Amino acid sequence: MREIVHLQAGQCGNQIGAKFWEVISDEHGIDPTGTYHGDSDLQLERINVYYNEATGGKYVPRAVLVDLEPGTMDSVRSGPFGQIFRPDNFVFGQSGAGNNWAKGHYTEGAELVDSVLDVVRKEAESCDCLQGFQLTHSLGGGTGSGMGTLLISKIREEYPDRIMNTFSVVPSPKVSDTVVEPYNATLSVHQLVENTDETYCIDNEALYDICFRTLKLTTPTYGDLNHLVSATMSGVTTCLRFPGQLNADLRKLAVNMVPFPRLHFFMPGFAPLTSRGSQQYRALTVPELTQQMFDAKNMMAACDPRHGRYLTVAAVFRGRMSMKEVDEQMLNVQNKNSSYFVEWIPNNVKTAVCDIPPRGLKMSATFIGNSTAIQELFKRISEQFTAMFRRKAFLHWYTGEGMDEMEFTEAESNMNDLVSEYQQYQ
């Protein structure tokens, strides 16, 4: 009745999607074989959102997994939950990307899109009423930033009256994994701004900081990192799958969080991230839950809200709770933070409540909020773009593939126009 089509691109998208389809399989009670093994009856009233029905009572994800290299598809199907992904839903090329935006968007990504548009048109026309789309990828790579942004342009012009959400992995100065990643970031962000509705910037210093001082883990493997971002992604769309007192889907979240079409950059956060030895010793209550949420420690972007001003803030709640304690705490945090919120718009906080918490917990929350402080992420990319483009470093990998310097010249100018637009509303 309201289906969500899931798009995974790149190596980073493949590992996040493997974790994401593991968590909501645990939430909906789906074994690695594909048969429902659960006890309650409310898990099947809304199961068609992510799972298509097949013979023998088997449920399969409505997701497509793409990458230019076949080296990561073998690891996807060799995972714990690699036996439920459809073999048709794997689209792979035979040549790499080389962390190049030009290779993945113009030369090698030109012929791999027509296969995946055929697959996604087959999937999208098979549902009764599609709620929207969803993509996770990485801007620091060649495939997710290159071919994924091609899928942004093609889908947005083929299905116009649909909602587009992206969980983008923004790059880092200190976790700089690629030499040429400022090129692959600016050329991805420029195509991303005009052709989406909701963006969620996930960055890796925040996940490394959370796994160090908040969870007290000594070996924060990517499986530990991906479980945090997958919990947020499952926490966004809880109202579509489970009932509650005040339901709010992705469209209702996007209306109240996006005042202007070029202001669509959020900055996520989660709730109870307590260490294993400290779980027994704390009282898990609503004021203790919302104390952690507004702090900058558990927040999943490498930006400080104290250096900026909030515009809109949303919180999605789970589990049985008193509505008065939600309204009193949101009013209290709005009154005490009279300087951290803008004054030209009242009631910047939105709330939503579901009744089903995740497994092993009793109530959780998800923080979705945009801020002016997200410009600190874009100022450091633009200044390192300008410092390197002036001496034409690594240019022959781009201008030798059919690209032109004018596309480089406009990309910085549109990105400078975006960071100039964020400043006026502070």
Binding site: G29, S40, T218, P243, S275, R276, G277, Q279, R320, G360
Partner: protein, 63 residues
């Protein structure tokens, strides 16, 4: 085992000895075994049922 000597966050190691020492050298390393993630994270009591307690179903019972 792990965390015998009393330095470098020995409490969390001693509390989670029973959850991170399942392997018996058949596999290379802890990172190689937990490449998919640690078994107990963000919760405990790993086998716990879904509640069927809807607010409407609790409030409106047969009188």
């Amino acid at each position: 085992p792990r965390g015998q000597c009393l330095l470098y966050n020995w409490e969390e190691e001693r509390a989670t000895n029973h959850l991170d020492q399942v392997p018996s050298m058949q596999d290379g390393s802890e990172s190689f075994f937990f490449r998919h993630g640690h078994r107990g994270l963000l919760t405990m009591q790993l086998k716990s049922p879904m509640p069927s307690s809807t607010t409407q179903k609790d409030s409106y019972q047969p009188p």
